[PDB]
Design a protein around this ligand. Structure first.
Ligand SMILES: NC(=O)c1ccc[n+]([C@@H]2O[C@H](COP(=O)([O-])OP(=O)(O)OC[C@H]3O[C@@H](n4cnc5c(N)ncnc54)[C@H](OP(=O)(O)O)[C@@H]3O)[C@@H](O)[C@H]2O)c1
Ligand SMILES: NC(=O)c1ccc[n+]([C@@H]2O[C@H](COP(=O)([O-])OP(=O)(O)OC[C@H]3O[C@@H](n4cnc5c(N)ncnc54)[C@H](OP(=O)(O)O)[C@@H]3O)[C@@H](O)[C@H]2O)c1
Ligand SMILES: NC(=O)c1ccc[n+]([C@@H]2O[C@H](COP(=O)([O-])OP(=O)(O)OC[C@H]3O[C@@H](n4cnc5c(N)ncnc54)[C@H](OP(=O)(O)O)[C@@H]3O)[C@@H](O)[C@H]2O)c1
Ligand SMILES: NC(=O)c1ccc[n+]([C@@H]2O[C@H](COP(=O)([O-])OP(=O)(O)OC[C@H]3O[C@@H](n4cnc5c(N)ncnc54)[C@H](OP(=O)(O)O)[C@@H]3O)[C@@H](O)[C@H]2O)c1
Ligand SMILES: [Cl-]
Ligand SMILES: [Cl-]
Ligand SMILES: [Cl-]
Ligand SMILES: [Cl-]
Ligand SMILES: [Cl-]
Ligand SMILES: [Cl-]
Ligand SMILES: [Cl-]
Ligand SMILES: [Cl-]
Ligand SMILES: [Cl-]
Ligand SMILES: [Cl-]
Ligand SMILES: [Cl-]
Ligand SMILES: [Cl-]
Ligand SMILES: [Cl-]
Lengths: 323, 323, 323, 323
């Protein structure tokens, strides 16, 4: 099924989405951004993710411009944005009512949209009571600025707290968690999220399926120019890649590449298909700095049929990290 | 009583309404559409039903144009529309919050109205949780896009689930089910709906009282040109008419025609009066492809006084399908 | 206390108000209407009552014009309107959600106001479920078309049903009943309403304190020209006045007039002061067809200090109708 | 921590704010007002407090003009206003629904803002039921005219009543009490408010930290010209200052001044730092009639590090009023 429900909700998303972290308003030109969105949409992708923090609001401006220039029906799109870091002032960050309302409004203005389909808490906020946050998310939904809301990088326990508060005060529960998932980061999505889906219907929209591009194997011989790890502000990622653990995972990619070759697909295709083997994952958010990557990555769908129980066991043997 | 309450609600509808399936924006010209609406309204009909799916939104455009051109008071009209199929994109169908809000908005824009009196779920949606659907219907009512909501082609059990959810979360329950009812399709309206009316006050607004025109007897000698069953896209109905069961019901119409003759009315008049003999039916939605049919059908009201216990028993004997 | 709380609510009304039944848009010219309102407002009256039914919406147009021409602060006024009969179509009457929303909107448009302070159900509606009515009143309050709501001519039992429904579904209860009260119609206000005020805080705003002018004594020798009972459409009142019971109450007025003379006030002043002796009555709605009547009637306040236990017992002896 | 949460809420305020009582639209010129706000904002103060009663709405006009002229981001500001006395008409005062909605609207218009961050009940209203007041505050929050609400000069018991009502009817509780606190008025903030913070999360935003300027010592030799106590309308404060108790507290200031000298700070710096020693106080609202006072007072932050347990015990010994 190319389209599936986002969690237990009635919202149907393509099993792949396109995100805008690093790229839109940042690494890539607005023309390249339009090309990516066009290729995505034309291949049936309906799901597009952004954040007020991405390129200091510029990702939102670019994405919104593209939607307006292309004239696509709003009802054919699922646009998601994430709130937490909205500026340098003390009151421009967090999940307070003030910042959720203010942040979402400013995002909608940059997007040139009346609403997003899903507004996410971009991370948890230990400085704001959960009740305030859930009331605030309910309020923006009830005011028609969002259709639904979700969490990102919250613990299962914090998600269930949101649910508890919604049920105690008759507010709207979140429908999705946006969680990291790839071959080297599996536990939350494979173990915790299933339990949460079965108990309160929260779905999983996953991110960094290539671990920021590491899974492509491109860092085998160091840091290529123009790679994410080469860019100003991503020394943290350069450090991860060049860590002992980074090199240990690079070694595993060589073994995985052999499986890809046998399937006649690329390692990224294999890695993204692997993420979707899981029917509990509603959608995998793709990142791409160029159209060739995006077109390749969308081919992961054609790999899904080849992912037998024996291939999956072979991958688990290589990775050594089944949770 | 020509006017009656739609269910337990305070909304008073004429016991006949005029629908727009097949005809408006489709089979008939906009001029014929205006003629029908004018004849209806002038005879005291206040109830007009349409759907976002009818003629791909054109039925709504035509109906809305007529209201605006005639200048009729909005407060004198009961306009109903039905949401489910709103386009070809994945997210343009169903009873998700996204589609209910989006679908109803687009319908209101086509209708050139600020609100409908009743928004219906056009069919059930196994892909959307009932809670989401009822919250969404509550939301459009609370935002002033609809006064009330209803269901169509839902089981008694699904209607009661909507009621359960409304009472559990203090949302708005539906006030009406729009169900098929005619001499050859009786069980839901005669058996189930009464129980539902008594338990949770949901009323019945019925449709296809002539079984798409079959009850007129016009298909006795095959498929007349210009008949609904002759039109592009209605081969399904041609197939029903020309089925063994279609011919078995045609044979019964000959016997019913004898009763009509004795009452000095037409078979359609008899059939529509028969539907209204039931005080549990709030209104019967008429269809008409021309004004003569509509004018004839409205004469069913004059037949109602002649429908004795003995006539009704004679009809049950002929039909052989009392549930 | 010239000003008092309307029931248990925080709304403070003058102990006299000015109503618009018969007069505004009807019996009196718009100039006379402006004169009355000006005299009222200038004497500290803040409370002005009207209805969509009064002179077919013209009372509302006149009252709204006067407010706009005078430039009075909206925050200094307490405007009340009453919904039930809003037109000739089936759906233009009653306390359905459709009619409450539609009726109040049209009233606000005629009044040229964004909201009324109090919207009243003008009478009870046996054809609309109480839940719908209370939800609808809650909705117009929550949408900012009214600040509060009330009932008129409802039984204590129906008022308490409204309260029950508000508490069961967390809706807004009514704050006031608008009830008839004068020397010949006492039971509801003197017996029932006190109990209702103590149990659920509902106050009493009373009407026809002169029994449509009968209490002035003007009908002693028949029906004077220009009197309310002389006007087209008030034969019912002529019939009451000229009934055996009408004449029995006229005879009592002669005895009451003797008490007025001893107090050095007019019979209407005595009658209105008598209505206000009751601290449970929040305000008495005055009617006046000319400014002399209004100015006289406002003088009732100066009579209140003279209304001893012995005077009140003398009046009860004359009336013979203490409940 | 210069910034802290306002109570248990997610709203983060600077530990000092700037108020507008007496000064804005009143004692000081609009130019001086802009200077004060600029100095405050530039030093990281985000919290600005006003009232519809201050200078009959002029404080609000001045504050709003300054915000608009400076172009400061709305999301970087925390604006608070207080409702109770909004005019001379009977219905222009109190915490009725009518006055809260009307008062807040008029304030927002004067401020030229779409919303305030916090709307306060400026005092308690024994003439309005708590339920009405809390429903009304919930309503203006839900309509987007305020983000949060608070109380001012309410007893702990009345605050907890607001909380009870919010929880019983699923309304929004208040997040803060605005209470007087200074070296001569300690009991409510030091004893009661802590208990309230721990039980229902209500924070404390304190006012008159210099007891209207008395704490500066400026009244040692009588009433200086241009002092608050010299102004038309402040004879009450002149009377306090020149009372036996006023002189008893003046004598203590001489002893406190010795502590200030040893710390190398001014008495006002000492007094404001003393108010903030308390982590339960979220913010202290400053008043200043000139920029030198404001700049001095902001230096209280630099005194906070010097406030040892032994200094605090010395101050308690001098004051003799530890509660
Ligand atoms: N909720 C959250 O906190 C959160 C956090 C992170 C991401 N996300 C979402 O998830 C989306 C995807 O995350 P991600 O961008 O980190 O995804 P990813 O797939 O892990 O990394 C994408 C990056 O890898 C490289 N790449 C992609 N396909 C490739 C291919 N076929 N061959 C070689 N290199 C390839 C590109 O980087 P180069 O520059 O090296 O070419 C591309 O920008 C984001 O846009 C965002 O919407 C959400
Ligand atoms: N909720 C739902 O899913 C749903 C589904 C179906 C319908 N409905 C509603 O119900 C309305 C009525 O349904 P329907 O149109 O199927 O009603 P119907 O009465 O069963 O069929 C009407 C059709 O029968 C023919 N006809 C009508 N009167 C006639 C007469 N006196 N003599 C000969 N033929 C006559 C006409 O067809 P010809 O073209 O043959 O002349 C006319 O278009 C619709 O417009 C719609 O609003 C709702
Ligand atoms: N909730 C409801 O169903 C309802 C029903 C009725 C009324 N009300 C409200 O109550 C208001 C007052 O009712 P009402 O008008 O029936 O009040 P009322 O005091 O019983 O009757 C007023 C009429 O009596 C005459 N009058 C007044 N003062 C007089 C005086 N000093 N001397 C001689 N005649 C005098 C005038 O009639 P003439 O034409 O004879 O001069 C005047 O129009 C109405 O406007 C309406 O707002 C509400
Ligand atoms: N919720 C409420 O009922 C309520 C009530 C009162 C206040 N408040 C809030 O609290 C804010 C502060 O209150 P407040 O103005 O009474 O505060 P305050 O600090 O007690 O008094 C400030 C006044 O003291 C003098 N002053 C300030 N700093 C000085 C210094 N360094 N040296 C000498 N004199 C100095 C100035 O008066 P001079 O004119 O003498 O120079 C100044 O206007 C108000 O603006 C208002 O926002 C709220
Ligand atoms: Cl928490
Ligand atoms: Cl995560
Ligand atoms: Cl990573
Ligand atoms: Cl379900
Ligand atoms: Cl609730
Ligand atoms: Cl059906
Ligand atoms: Cl059929
Ligand atoms: Cl009822
Ligand atoms: Cl009454
Ligand atoms: Cl009468
Ligand atoms: Cl109270
Ligand atoms: Cl205080
Ligand atoms: Cl003081």
């Amino acid at each position: 099924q190319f389209y599936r429900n986002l969690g237990k909700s009635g919202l149907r998303v393509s099993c792949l989405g396109l995100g805008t972290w690093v790229t839109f308003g940042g690494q890539i030109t607005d023309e390249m951004a339009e090309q990516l969105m066009t290729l995505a949409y034309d291949n049936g992708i309906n799901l597009f993710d952004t954040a007020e923090v991405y390129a200091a609001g510029k990702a939102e401006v670019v994405l919104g411009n593209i939607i307006k220039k292309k004239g696509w029906r709003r009802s054919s799109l699922v646009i998601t944005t994430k709130i937490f870091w909205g500026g340098k002032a003390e009151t421009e960050r967090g999940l307070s009512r003030k910042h959720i309302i203010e942040g979402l409004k400013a995002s909608l203005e940059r997007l040139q949209l009346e609403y997003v389909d899903v507004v996410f808490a971009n991370r948890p906020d230990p400085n704001t009571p959960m009740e305030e946050t859930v009331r605030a998310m309910t309020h923006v939904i009830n005011q028609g600025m969002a259709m639904y809301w979700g969490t990102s990088r919250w613990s299962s326990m914090e998600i269930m707290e949101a649910y508890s508060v919604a049920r105690q005060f008759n507010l709207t529960p979140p429908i999705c968690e946006q969680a990291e998932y790839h071959m080297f980061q599996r536990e939350k999505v494979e173990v915790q999220l299933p339990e949460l889906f079965h108990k309160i219907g929260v779905g999983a929209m996953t991110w960094s399926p290539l671990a920021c591009g590491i899974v492509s194997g491109k860092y085998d011989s160091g840091i290529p120019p123009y790679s994410r790890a080469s860019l100003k502000g991503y020394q943290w990622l350069k450090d991860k890649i060049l860590s002992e653990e980074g090199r240990r995972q690079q070694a595993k990619l060589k073994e995985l590449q052999a499986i890809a070759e046998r399937l006649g697909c690329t390692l990224p295709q294999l890695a993204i298909a692997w993420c979707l083997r899981n029917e509990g994952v509603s959608s995998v958010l793709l990142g791409a700095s160029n159209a060739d990557q995006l077109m390749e990555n969308i081919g992961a769908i054609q790999v899904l049929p080849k992912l037998s129980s024996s291939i999956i066991h072979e991958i688990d043997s290589i990775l050594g990290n089944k949770p």
